[PDB]
Structure formats: C-alpha cells, structure tokens
Symmetry: D2
Subunit: 217 residues, 4 copies
C-alpha cells in the first residue's frame, strides 16, 4: 500500500510477430488502480503499418487496474513493489493462435511492462489479416487458483465489420514475484476500447475499465 497511489503511470515496450512478420510498439499511459480505469497512447516503432487487426494486441497492453471490493483478495495490488508476470494463450475459432507474456515491474509511480507477443496460423482471408474487426465486446474473466498461482480464463469476442462475432478463448497465468495471499474463485468484468487512432493505427489511444466481483449471490 506504500508503493501504490490513486494515480499511477505506465511505460511499455512490446516486441512481436504475427504470421512471422515482426513489429514493435511502445506505450505511455496512466491509470487509477482503485477505480479500475486506465488509458494509454501507443506508437508503432517497427513493422508498421501493421498488416493485421490491431485489436488482437490490445489486451496485452495489468490486473492492478481493476476495482477490487474489500471482500475479495487482490492478488495484484499485493504483489508490489516486487511485481508479477503473466503468460497468456489466445485461441481464435478459425485456428489463429496468439501467445503473449508481460513482465511487470514498478519504478516510483510508474509501472514498466516488457511484453512479447506472437501469433500464427491466421488465414489470409480471415478477419484478422483482412482487418475486419470493430472492437472487443466487454467480458467477464473467471479467476481461480491452480498450483499456488492465479489463473484467469475468459471467453472473448471481436465484433466484425458488417455484423457477427469472431470468438477467442483466453487462458492467462498470473505469477507474483513474492508470496502473496491467494484469492477465492472470483470474476473481473472488463471493457477495453480503442478511443482513437490514426488511419494505419501507427497511433492508438486505448482505454480499459475493469471491476472484480463475486457473481450472483
């Protein structure tokens, strides 16, 4: 509680590849960990203009930014100052698959992310390579302990240009760098949105709102 604040900053670099084509993106942002709200500005540094839907990247750009009620243990805020890392697979219904990692540290009032992102087997005529996505729908992540660490699974869906949805299943493993108290089974509602972007997504402004809860009584 001594290393967290109502207003915190964020710096990140992501290095990655999709279908074997490499890229890099850097980001600067800020957020309110107790309000579960954050935003950031992202710039493509290498590999631009990106030949795939930017939306596949956005959830890689920290569950610290989620409003936790007092009756649910907060694995993430506990993990600082040491921080935590996460690993994630994102399996799309047409066989496209991405995996990503984020190592999160803290310097003063600024979270620092080192992100790797890789994706393969996206069909050339699919919504990802043809940039036919509109946005992620809001979601509810299911979090539970497994082997002394925290898992989070979520059914995600991208709405598509001209209607319909493109589904993806997320499986995330979260690992605190120190021993923290482990939570009971719980949920985090999310809503991630690209608020603005330039024509080729070289510049993107991204927002997330997230709140933990215990489901129906």
């Amino acid at each position: 509680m001594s290393v967290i604040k109502p207003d915190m900053k964020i710096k990140l670099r992501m290095e990655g590849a999709v279908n074997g084509h490499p890229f890099a993106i850097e980001g600067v942002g800020l957020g309110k960990p107790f309000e579960g709200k954050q935003s950031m500005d992202l710039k493509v540094k290498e590999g631009g203009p990106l030949p795939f839907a930017y939306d596949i990247l956005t959830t890689a750009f920290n569950r610290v930014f989620a409003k936790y009620p007092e009756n649910i243990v907060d694995y993430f805020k506990q993990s600082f100052p040491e921080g935590y890392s996460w690993e994630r697979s994102m399996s799309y219904e047409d066989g496209g698959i991405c995996i990503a990692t984020n190592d999160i540290t803290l310097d003063g009032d600024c979270y620092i992310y080192e992100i790797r992102f890789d994706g393969v087997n996206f069909p050339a005529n699919g919504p990802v390579m043809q940039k036919r996505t509109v946005k992620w729908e809001p979601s509810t992540e299911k979090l539970y302990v497994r082997d002394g660490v925290l898992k989070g699974d979520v059914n995600m869906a991208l709405s598509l240009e001209g209607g319909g949805h493109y589904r993806c299943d997320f499986k995330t493993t979260y690992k605190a760098k120190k021993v923290v108290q482990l939570p009971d089974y719980h949920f985090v509602d999310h809503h991630i949105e690209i608020k603005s972007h330039d024509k080729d997504y070289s510049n993107v402004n991204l927002h997330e709102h997230a709140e933990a809860h215990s489901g129906l009584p």
Copy 2:
C-alpha cells in the same frame, strides 16, 4: 406473452450414458421466468446409484428462467408457445467430454423437456468418476448470434473436495422453433446449486438463479 406466467411448472425426462453406462432421470419443478429463479426435484429412475458426479448433469436440467432487462431482446420468452431446442458440448480439462440436447415444449403452464445426455473419456481416477466435486461456481454466459441462431459459451468450474477447481468449457446452440427477434451480444449470470440430496443422489433438489445484463458500460 399470453402463454407465459409469473409462475410456471416443469416436467422432464433425461436419458443418458456416461462412459457407456446408461441411466434415466425424471424431474418435476417450478419457476418464476421473470425473476430468473427455478427449482426442481429429480429422481433417478434407471442406472442408479449413479457411479459419477451428479454435478455433471445439473445444467442439463432452460434460459426462459433468466431475468431479462427491457433493453435486451429475450430470445427465449419470444420462442413460445412453439418453444425451442438446445445442443451443448461440455469439454472438461482432463479430456472428459459431455454432449447434451434438450427439446423444450409447452403444455398449459408446464414446460416439458426431452433431454439426452452422453459423456465419455472421464478417467477412472478423475474427479467425476471418483465423485470429488462440491458444486459449480457461479458463472457468466456469453451469448451472441451466429448463422441466425443464438450461441452461448461459458467458462464453468467445479470446486473440488479438499480445494481447487476442475474446469469445463460449455458451447451451447439455442434454436427457436419459430422466427423470433435476435438479440445483440449480451451476458447471463448464473448460479446453480444442489440444495439437498439423499446419500446416493437418487433424489436431488436443484435451484438456479439467472439474470441477463450488458456488461460494463
């Protein structure tokens, strides 16, 4: 709206098999479709005492019983008097897999279910065949239209005897027997509970509470 009521009745028969061993269960219940609450009493008629965790069956024992706000189209209540059917696969993390169908009709104030349930590849030393499950956790189902019908996917988890969770992914397809208005992407929170049961689950009293919503703003 002429064939629905604040209080409705339910009759069902399920015929099925798990790992090749057949069984049959009948049920009688009642519920409040606008409150999203229901309960029923279930009796094993054949194949008892069941050699597997009763919990795998319980979600087969109707999304009519979910509280829908006025701003979300209600695919289910619209579908009557003709009714609707559903198909579901339930894929467990240890390779166990169940599929089920329910054809739902309506007679007076009573819903009538014809249910088939089949499951295979449950390991002999797994939580299902060793009856090590405690209950399903509450959940949030994600519902979206695909090919003119309604899909519902949910990350489910069974809490286990002595701690931890056993995960299962549900994919349901819902099919109205007449043309109804299709909803936008939305959610249904659920909480299913066995309220009471006898020693070998020959008799079970089952409750569900469910409410639709639109996620975080």
Copy 3:
C-alpha cells in the same frame, strides 16, 4: 482360439445428431488376421438421414487390424470376454460427436451395441449439407494411459469440389479382462463406402487396417 480367420458381425447403433434420433443395424464379416472387414448397414429409424453418413462410419473394432508378431495385440487378447470403447470426434467447425461401442462375442459373431451422438454442426457446414466424399486413409497413434489403451487420430473428410474438413479422434479402449498392454504403436486405416443407395438407407462399408511401429532407429 476364439478368434478364427473368418468371423461375423452384428450391430445396432442408436443415436442422434443435432437432437434428431435415428437407428441403424448392420450385418458383416471380416478377417481379423488380414485386417479387413465389410458390412451392410440399414437405417431402421430416423431415415432419410439429414446429415452426412460419413460421420457414422468409424463407429461401425480394432480386432480387425493386422498386428505383426512384435506388437502386443490388445484387442485379440480381450476375447472371449471382449472390450468396449469410447470416442470423441472433434470437428474443426465446432461440430462434435461422441460414441461408445460395447463389443461381445457369440460363437463366431461379434456383437456391437453402439451409441452415437453429435451436436453443434452448423446448418451450412459440410455435415448438415452432405458435402463429404470420403474419409482419407489415416494413421492412428496408440499408447497406454491409466492401465488402458488410448488411440488418437487426425482424420480428414475430402469435400465435394475440393479441400478437406478435419476431425480429431480420441478413443479409449477398455478390455473386460486383464490383458497384456502394448508399447506405443500405430494402426494405418482406410475406410470406404463401397456402395450405397440414394439416401444412404443401405450402405456397404469396408475397412482395411494394419498395425506397425513407424520408422526405425
């Protein structure tokens, strides 16, 4: 010694696909040591089948596989008491079937009791639209797990007008008595509908199968 060079087969399958029930009976003959068999199948209920017959055919016994002397034959050892199998068949478009077969022996005739169930086949997919031509030949991978025998296979249906539709099989085989367990091995398969009438009310089906150990070193 209860296994003769020429043996007979009788079966009944009861099943449902997308909730629509059907029943099929079969009479055949095969040569266990040659790994070849054939049979005539008749739809008894639910005809004309509204789905691709090909999804059913591998449900219609690894006794009919030529094993070399240097590979333990789990199947031929299991008689006269017999064995059962359970199988999930997961199609790439989300269609999923599960099946069971209880196999017994009466004189020189194998008797099969088969249950088959399938759900979530899209209305416009190759199964509901009857766009399949045949299964490609395949190589099943077999290995022991928990004292029983597993067999996994990548299957593909060739499609009318070109291309393939993929399905992953996961089978569990369970001898009714204790038999000697094999090392990791393979069975090559080729299953074919040799003839059928217009609506597949009558089908003549053949299979050739041979076990092997793969490439050496």
Copy 4:
C-alpha cells in the same frame, strides 16, 4: 537443380518459454533425397535451459523428407526462393508453443531464422520438470487449404518412468513462389537426440522422414 544430394544447414533460434528468453544456434548437414539430416546445436543465451529441450527439436524443414515420384513435393519445388512455416503445438496439460521458420538458400546451405515461444507450462509438469525421454516416431497428415499446405500431427513424448505426454501440431507451410500443390498425403517422421551434454548446452540431433500415401484401395 539447386537441390543437391548433400546440403548444409545454418540456423539461429530466438525464443522464450514461460517468459524466459534464450537463443540457440545450429550447424548441420542432410540428404534431401534420403530424407535424413543431422545437426549440432549450441545454446548461446539463456542457458542452462530450465525446460525440456525436446519441446524445441521439431523447430530445428520438410525438404529433408524422401518423396516418391507419385507425390508432388511442395518443398523441393519452393527453392531457390524458399518457403516459411508457422506452427502451433498444443500440449495436453495446456502448455502451448508457437514457432515460425523462414527458410532461405545460400549456395548449398539452407539458412533458418526461427522464433519459438511457449507459455502456460505448469511448474510441476513434465516440461518444466525435465521428465521427457524422446518424441515417438510420428505420421504427419498434409493437405492443401487456401492455396497453401497444412500439416497436422499427433505427437507424443515418452516420459521418464513410463507413459506418454501428448501434443497436437498444426503447421502451415508457405512457398515464397507459386509451386504445384500436392494431393492429401503423409510424412512419417522419427526425430532423435543422439547425444547431448549434461545441461543440453550441446545437442546432436537427427531426423529421418519419408512421404507416403497410406494404405491403398
């Protein structure tokens, strides 16, 4: 004609497993028409590797496969321009790896640029605990999809003290120029670590591979 009976190989792989980065370089030689190859691999960064080396080895070219005259050889046709591949490797305990290889040709030497990433390997699983012995031999199933070549394979690692750990491979192969496309076919494989030092800093790896058409009729 740019394909000679004896050819050389040079590669560099950069990667990460559970977020921990590493780099490996390789020098080898093979006989494209005999379907045999071998190579010496050296960890350059990230050593000693904290995970089972076996997960990496299939990333270290189907040019090295003996094709019969009656099967179109997608790989040998693709040179001198070369081809690339993308692959997902989904392990039965939820561990998942994805890899890419861009293959070019310089004189008589193939050059590989490989990226490898893996996540969600459980701390107590056979990969993180180094409990693997070797890959079993396998049969890859290859088929055209969207004008490119797919190859799927059921793989198994034998485990220290018995049993197997399963992995499903899905590979996409992409020629850099237009080549003639093959019919559905198979490639049998056998990959082996022939020697290694204590911490796998040095590894000698061999593969034998032969294409075929499966059982006839």
